[model samples]
Target: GKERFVKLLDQLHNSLRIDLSMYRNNFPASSPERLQDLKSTVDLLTSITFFRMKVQELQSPPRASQVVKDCVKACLNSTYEYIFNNCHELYGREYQTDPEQGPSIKNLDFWSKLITLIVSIIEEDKNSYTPCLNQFPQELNVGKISAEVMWSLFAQDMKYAMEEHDKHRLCKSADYMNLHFKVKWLYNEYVAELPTFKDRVPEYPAWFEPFVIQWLDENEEVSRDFLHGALERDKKDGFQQTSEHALFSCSVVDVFSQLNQSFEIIKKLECPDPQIVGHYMRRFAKTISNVLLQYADIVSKDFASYCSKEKEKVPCILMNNTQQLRVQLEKMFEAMGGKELDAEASGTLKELQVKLNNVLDELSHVFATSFQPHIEECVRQMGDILSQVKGTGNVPASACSSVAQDADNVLQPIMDLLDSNLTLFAKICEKTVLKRVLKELWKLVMNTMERTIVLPPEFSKLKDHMVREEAKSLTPKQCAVVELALDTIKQYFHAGGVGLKKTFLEKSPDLQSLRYALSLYTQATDLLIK
Candidate 1:
């Protein structure tokens, strides 16, 4: 009896196939009466679907349940094909173009009608067919399946049109805009408006993948070339004064401004895949870091080649540009979602920030080092002042009649030199840049003082012939002179609360080392050994 029952179920599954085929052949798709025939077929399948569910509810065996699932899958597949083929016949191969408008897809009455019918069928399936069909072994969601099949079919013709344009070497702008318009229409009209399609993400065609990637790549390369040319022009042009307070190079502003367009386009694209977005952003960051670092190198090279008068303001402007780069890049990083981006992309941006920071440090170091020769010249004059004094052992401060005068004479020249250099920097530099330069100058000055004055080397070891080596140790009178020089230099750097902080000056390791060495110099030789 079960054998006959199973045979009857299989026979019933195929009974309506002949009628469905006759309906398809008689009414060519998209005819006014074709929709009625499609509905009749759907009604018959729905009746069969309900009967299959009732049989399953009566405790059917697995084989019978599976037979019902097979029938449901077949009916669903056929219906999806009917919808796609009919829509495809209506849409035609070529996208309709407007003569005056170049490329366009604004004509949408046909698409609207087609989608209306499809959505109505989807509603029919949801209310009647899927509920009964899903009771079988194969669970079916007609809404999702229908959307996928229909959307993919829709994407097929678009892909074909795009390929045709690509093959002919047609106007790229027209094609790009045409595709953008289509994407906008599909999103708003279908993807956004359809309640059934809300949870599912739609896919772009395969061609769109590389097309978007190529477009972004072109944007990136153009940005790179623009920055490269602008930077080179900046170097060739030297410094041009735009406004009094404008301390950064114009190229910095230009490059950053250009960068925002890329981010803007990416946001408008609204691509859900992180890998594509991540890759483009990584390239963007690399462009920024590479260009900024190259700009830093140019500034350093200019620093070395130009004389003090020609180079002072230029380096300061370049420093501010690098500093501005850090700020702009951080903003870009945050706009790009920073750590929330794909792991690889976040790492790239983080590395870029590190590089930007290092370049600022490098520029500051280079700017500070350029002042060494001037420092050396001033220190040499101080050495000449110190060499005139005599005696190796401690002498009373009172014994040297010109004790205070000696300190002023030796230190005044350098203080005057620093005041001139720093005042020029103050007028030209951004406050932050000037502060950095001052810190560097502080280190160089303290180290040079310790090397030449606090602890004089052997006469034979002196690098410059300017100072005939004095006594290896200073007399107490010379020591007092050196101490006064230290205090005066410290005060000059403090600059009445506007320059370096007193706390920074007081806590400097170089000052600490010099003071400790001076104290060691005064220790009894016997106690020093112990």
Candidate 2:
């Protein structure tokens, strides 16, 4: 019967959930319950997207379909049976599971409060949206990614970017130009880098651009004022660093959510499709923009603090925080709807160029310190093969063991956070002191080859037929270093010995063919006594 009740309600709405356990006693001052033996508790799920509409309509005069009525009846019956059977696990605790130790409020009172809050939310939605619905007249236009909004966005920036007499401002100072540049770059980079999104419309940036201006012009003031008022109540916040980007983001997200609700009314007014491309982009833009500035601000404050002589040593917190910030920045790049840009910053961040250098230098030191363990492990693995001399020093190059793979394996932890911007890492990790380990390892790697007539065990897999038909995948027993040479040094050991990498790359073992005469010279002379 409960399942039937659930299915019947589902006929009207899919997302609505049927709660079979909730308040079991006093229904509220308004309850009209009777005979108890078969009664039970019931719960209902509501959100801005769903049953809120029906409840809003019911505010003046309750008119609902059979499903809505069934849901209501199910709640009433479940409430009845809950008290009749006396089962109140959720709100039924008699002795008070309230960790705050409020014995004054009973379980029934607790649940009744939840009910009141839900009612309050539905009422607020009704009051707020009723006037809003009047703003969008009937026949809501099928809002596509159109030029009107795009122009509105571009024009907002152009207004900011232009001087009073209409000359263009230098690109850096004008906030509008800055955001515009980043958005275009983000879009261009995304399109060029991700071929998969090639067919998708590129108009999302244009569509979302206006919202940024509105946030800057309107919403931030109200939310920031709210934060200020809260601080007035409690001033402890000045103690640590924070971001308005986050709070400003909350206002923007609320604006976005309200837009979703606003659009829902518009869709109802016109009977147009409920989904739109810009809606999703609005969300994507919010996510990226929020992250782009949020933690970077944290990084900036810490960097500035570190630079100040007042703080002699950079805090451990700053190091850990910047690494995490970099991780987030990587995510923001992926989700960012438009090109990367410097997020709006406080005066503290305004002069962070030198401070950023200080931070990155220290950050690199931290990354290398963390990564040195893996470099050591990689050397340890590669050295084992290098030291072994099974027979002749004339080993096949293809005989390289998993030394290359093992070296790559140990890079995984830092790679999880840092791999996307290896160029940036190359900037830091290439220090002679830090990189000396790999340089010596490379020398050892070059030493690990063999001599004489052995096909490297890598060829041991040669099903006799594959040897004739296929190219040799084989390297000699002691020569695992050969396979990893170009790979390890070229990719990981950047910043060291120029020609070692260049020679391996330019002279990639010519898989073209083995000239019989080449083998005559392939035999090398012995090393002289030191």
Candidate 3:
């Protein structure tokens, strides 16, 4: 008798008996008429809701066969399929709009309607039928079945819209980001109120993976090409001055700005899972490290060519570029979360900073090396003058002018070399590079002076014939001349008013070494033996 009664209910108040042909007459998905159609559809679902309650009353006996329950589910599923087909027709039908604006919202209307219909079903099922269907199996529960069916339909519609949007638009265009972001927002909003079916809603839309992956791949390609192009363009044009005080290449700033913009966009996508977010962070970190490191390599390689060609400006500019990379990479690392990121990415970035630092050191060394031949000649001239000096400390006061004249003559050429080159270097090179070069020159001058003038013949390793001709120790007059030259040279490098600081010049080991060697010359003969 119960089975016979369920067949009768299925025959009489079924989903097929409800009328929706008026909706097929093509009312706008967002139209008031379509809204009325949804209301009517809800009314029919309401009737089905009561019909389910009546069936549940009959199936009340424990372990009752779900024969009648199956019939009602089939009825509910048919109505959901019909609604799915109706909304499916409304998607991707582009409507014309004003110039310079994006695509229209006809599809959004369809999506909105689907959301409204699902929310209506969820509300009706939860409000009218709750606290009643809990006793039965889910397959026999009317509200559960209807809610799941509608949610499935909503999810399928989302998938269809994403696919249609992807298919019709240019791949990885600006519109791609806009579309995916909208869908993510919609997915999140739709699931927010769905306490009943929240677990069933996917973590993200199924199309999310392929779409984001393709977009990321495109971004990767474009960013790398842009960085490469920027590097090449800067290489051809050489570094342009942004301002008198600017110390870095414009290309590096441009590349980082664009890359940082890309990172900001990825951050905006706001993927909820940390691993997924980490996936993106790591990929960008890799790109950031690779591009900047490659940029450092190019700067390093060009330093040698710049050195070989004896171009002072480009080498300094290249060294400054590496310094810029060091600074900007540190900022990028912090932005990427530093030690909080995956070990390899943080390690890679830290290693990159050290590598760029070493590159700067190498460029500075090579640049200072290029000036080696000139400094050597200056020292050689000083050696010749000191070697030629004649007289003893016992010369009379009236002869002081002659001795001073010889000292001035001996120092003039070396001073001229320093003044010309250092003035240009101070003007063109960064202060740091200039200081490094100065340190190198100080060591060279001191070592050469000590070896050529202060050491014995065998220890000095002077050329065989020249060693035979030269004196191992300076005469008292030559020692006085050497003292005058050393004071003048130290003062020149210090540049009392504006150059390297007095403390640095005074504390230099090279300066001290030269002064000590000269002191040994002036030492008591017996004390020198001790």
Give the local distance difference test score of model 3: 0.63
Instruction: Give the clash count for each candidate.
Output: 0, 24, 0
At residue 512, what lDDT does model 2 achieve? Answer: 16
lDDT of each residue in 395-466, candidate 2, tens digit only:
776654365554444334334323443343233332432243233433332222221122232333465543
State the lDDT of candidate 3 residue by residue for 1-530, as single tens digits.
Answer: 98897677566554433332222222223356564554455455445656676756655232222433454355445656655555434333322244111222233445554555555555554544332333344544555555665666656756766677656544445555655576566556544345564655455435555566666677878887898789778877777645678866778788889888988887676676566667677667677777787787776766777775455677777776677777777887888777787777777777777777777777777777776676667777877887788764455656544557777888876787677777876776667667766766666777777766565334344665334434346666777777778877777777675466788878888888877766756542315345
> How many residue pairs in model 1 have overlapping backbones?
0
Worst 10 residues of 1 by lDDT: 99-108
Q: Residue 235: error of model 1 in Å?
A: 3.5
TM-score of 1: 0.65
lDDT of 1 at 496: 90
What ranges in model 3 sit over 4 Å off? 1-88, 92-179, 188-202, 205-221, 308-311, 338-340, 390-411, 426-435, 450-456, 459-471, 480-530
lDDT of all predictions, in order shown?
Answer: 0.63, 0.34, 0.63
